[PDB]
């Protein structure tokens, strides 16, 4: 029975994870929860249902309202990870703020079931140096797919890793069409129900950019051998092409419970985690290229990744600041990626490899401040 800490338990991934665990008592047990404090009703229900009071709440006043909270403050999640015996830490926090808990999870020796891609993108080589082989297991569906498909050959036989992208609500739209996009319109993802950040990032295509960096970091494949194809149904979750011309693909109706279940149970599958494809009804899986002129977020992510060092932290931190500005009505939708480009292209000093967490934090601070100057 694996002991699981769930960071960001009240969120989209976190709540789906608690459901998988609730359905599988003989294999998993919750031993800790962390949240921000914005959803106390959810947190209350989760405390009662799991019987776990080992909980972190970032916001101090929220922690007082809910009562009986052992860790509060901006370091509460990190402290929780440091002070809880666990076999798996499921990091489902949102944003680069997942960085210290990610580093702490790796130091404990526990498996890190990583949903919080921003922590790996920001940490880069610093997070890789803190992990042992196989210690980080991806929850993100593309990387879960890739890990499964890589069982299909030897390392020297892999040609390309191919990520699928839904294309978002604005698939096929012109650059001009993006001008008057509202937060409401950006909020309507075609295939997944998610928190507001991954929703916005999937609309701007920054999510797929983050995922290209995540792919390079997790699997050690060169950027030039990572492809991205737009697949509107989000049924094929990604695929691997081998040197003989064969492709192996992983597929299922979009439901994050499946990759969540596998990250927890790895390498053993979890019976009944999610519905399989049903071929008793006619259907079709479509594929099309991404228009890189309209959506250059992925090319920008490749540029950031190839530069390496703290540049991937810069890419993500510029996004976090610019996205927030869009959500607040201070900038238009195209300015999100426009600001990322501007910040990235001014960031040559950050191509250096981080020695400690503080180097990544510095790079992020620099990027946010510059993005903020672009906004105003």
Ligand X SMILES: NC(=O)C1=CN([C@@H]2O[C@H](COP(=O)(O)OP(=O)(O)OC[C@H]3O[C@@H](n4cnc5c(N)ncnc54)[C@H](OP(=O)(O)O)[C@@H]3O)[C@@H](O)[C@H]2O)C=CC1
Q: How far is the CB of 190 from a copy of itself (least distance, A)?
A: 16
Nearer to a copy of itself (CB atom), residue 277 or residue 355: 277
Q: How far is the CB of 241 from a copy of itself (least distance, A)?
A: 5
Quick one: 93 exposed, middle or buried, by C-beta within 10 A (0-12, 13-18, 19+)? buried
Cβ 314 vs Cβ 339: under 8 Å = no
Which residue is it, tokens 């946010």? Answer: 368
C-alpha angle 250-8-130 in degrees, rounded to nearest 5:
75
Q: Which does 195 bind (CB under 5 to 8 A by kind): ligand FOM, ligand X, a copy of itself, none?
A: ligand X
Which range touches ligand X (CB under 6 A), out of 155-163, 188-196, 226-234, 303-311? 188-196
Which residue is it, tokens 């008793």? Answer: 280
Q: Is 10 in the site for ligand X (CB under 6 A)?
A: yes
| Alpha-carbon distances, residue 319 vs 140, 339, 362 (angstroms) | 19, 8, 16
Q: Which does 34 bind (CB under 5 to 8 A by kind): a copy of itself, Mn ion, ligand FOM, none?
A: none
Q: Is 319 in the site for ligand FOM (CB under 6 A)?
A: no
Q: Is 45 in the site for ligand X (CB under 6 A)?
A: no
Q: Is 214 in the site for ligand FOM (CB under 6 A)?
A: no
Cβ 87 vs Cβ 110: under 8 Å = yes
| Phi, psi for residue 333 in degrees, rounded to 5 | -60, -45
| Alpha-carbon distances, residue 131 vs 86, 111, 168 (angstroms) | 16, 9, 33
Nearer to ligand FOM (CB atom), residue 9 or residue 207: 207
If one counts every other C-beta atom within 10 angstroms of the C-beta of residue 133, the result is: 5
Q: Which of 3, 39, 45, 225 binds ligand X (CB under 6 A)?
A: 39
Q: Is 142 in the site for ligand FOM (CB under 6 A)?
A: yes
Q: How far is the CB of 105 from a copy of itself (least distance, A)?
A: 24
Q: Which of 142, 211, 214, 227 binds a copy of itself (CB under 8 A)?
A: 227
C-alpha angle 254-262-206 in degrees, rounded to nearest 5:
50
Nearer to a copy of itself (CB atom), residue 153 or residue 308: 153
Query: What's the CA gap between 110 and 185, in Å, rounded?
Result: 40
Q: Which of 141, 250, 312, 319 binds ligand FOM (CB under 6 A)?
A: 141
Q: Which of 108, 125, 191, 247 binds a copy of itself (CB under 8 A)?
A: 247
Site string for a copy of itself, 125-164 (x = CB under 8 A): -----------------------xx-xxxx--x-xx-x--
Query: What's the CA gap between 285 and 287, in Å, rounded?
Result: 7
Which residue is it, tokens 């920054």? Answer: 206
Q: Which does 78 bind (CB under 5 to 8 A by kind): ligand X, ligand FOM, Mn ion, none?
A: none
Question: Which candidate, 176, 153, 178, 179, places its Cα nearest to that of 168?
Answer: 178
Q: Is 355 in the site for ligand X (CB under 6 A)?
A: no
Cβ 270 vs Cβ 177: under 8 Å = no
Cβ 174 vs Cβ 294: under 8 Å = yes
Site residue total, a copy of itself (CB under 8 A): 51
Q: Is 269 in the site for a copy of itself (CB under 8 A)?
A: yes
Which range touches ligand FOM (CB under 6 A), out of 40-48, 147-155, 163-171, 282-290? 163-171
Which range touches ligand FOM (CB under 6 A), out of 11-19, 129-137, 201-209, 325-333? 201-209
Enumerate binding residues for ligand FOM (CB under 6 A). Answer: 140-142, 165-166, 168, 192, 198, 202, 207-208
């Amino acid at each position: 029975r694996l002991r699981v800490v769930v960071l960001g338990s009240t969120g989209s991934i976190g709540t789906q994870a608690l459901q998988v665990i609730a359905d599988n008592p003989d294999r998993f047990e919750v031993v800790g929860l962390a949240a921000g404090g914005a959803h106390l009703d959810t947190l209350l229900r989760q405390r009662a249902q799991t019987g776990v009071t080992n909980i972190a709440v970032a916001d101090e006043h929220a922690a007082q309202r809910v009562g009986d909270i052992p860790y509060h403050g901006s370091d509460a999640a990190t402290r929780l990870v440091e002070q809880t015996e666990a076999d798996v830490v499921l990091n489902a926090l949102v944003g680069a703020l997942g960085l210290r808990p990610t580093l702490a999870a790796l130091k404990t020796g526990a498996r890190l079931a990583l949903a919080n891609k921003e922590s790996l993108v920001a940490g880069g080589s610093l997070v890789l140096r803190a992990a042992r082989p196989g210690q980080i297991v991806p929850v993100d569906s593309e990387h879960s797919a890739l890990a499964q498909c890589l069982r299909g050959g030897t390392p020297d036989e892999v040609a390309k890793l191919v990520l699928t992208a839904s294309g978002g609500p604005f698939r096929g739209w012109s650059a001009a069409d993006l001008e008057h996009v509202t937060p409401e319109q950006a909020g309507a993802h075609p295939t997944y129900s998610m928190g507001p950040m991954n929703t916005l990032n999937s609309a701007s295509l920054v999510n797929k950019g983050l995922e290209v960096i995540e792919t390079h970091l997790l699997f050690g494949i060169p950027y030039d051998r990572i492809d991205v194809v737009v697949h509107p149904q989000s049924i094929i979750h990604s695929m691997v092409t081998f040197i003989d011309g064969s492709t192996i693909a992983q597929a299922s109706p979009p439901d994050m419970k499946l990759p969540i279940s596998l990250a927890l149970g790895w390498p053993r599958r979890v019976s009944g985690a999610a519905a399989a494809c049903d071929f008793h009804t006619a259907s079709s899986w479509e594929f099309e290229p991404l228009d890189t002129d309209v959506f250059p977020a992925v090319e920008l992510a490749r540029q950031a990744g190839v530069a390496g060092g703290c540049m991937t932290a810069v890419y993500n931190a510029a996004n976090e600041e610019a996205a927030a500005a869009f959500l607040a009505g201070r900038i238009g939708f195209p300015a999100i990626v426009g600001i990322i480009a501007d910040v990235l292209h001014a960031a040559d000093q950050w191509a250096v490899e981080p020695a400690t967490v503080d180097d990544v934090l510095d790079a992020q601070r620099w990027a946010r401040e510059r993005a903020q100057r672009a906004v105003s």
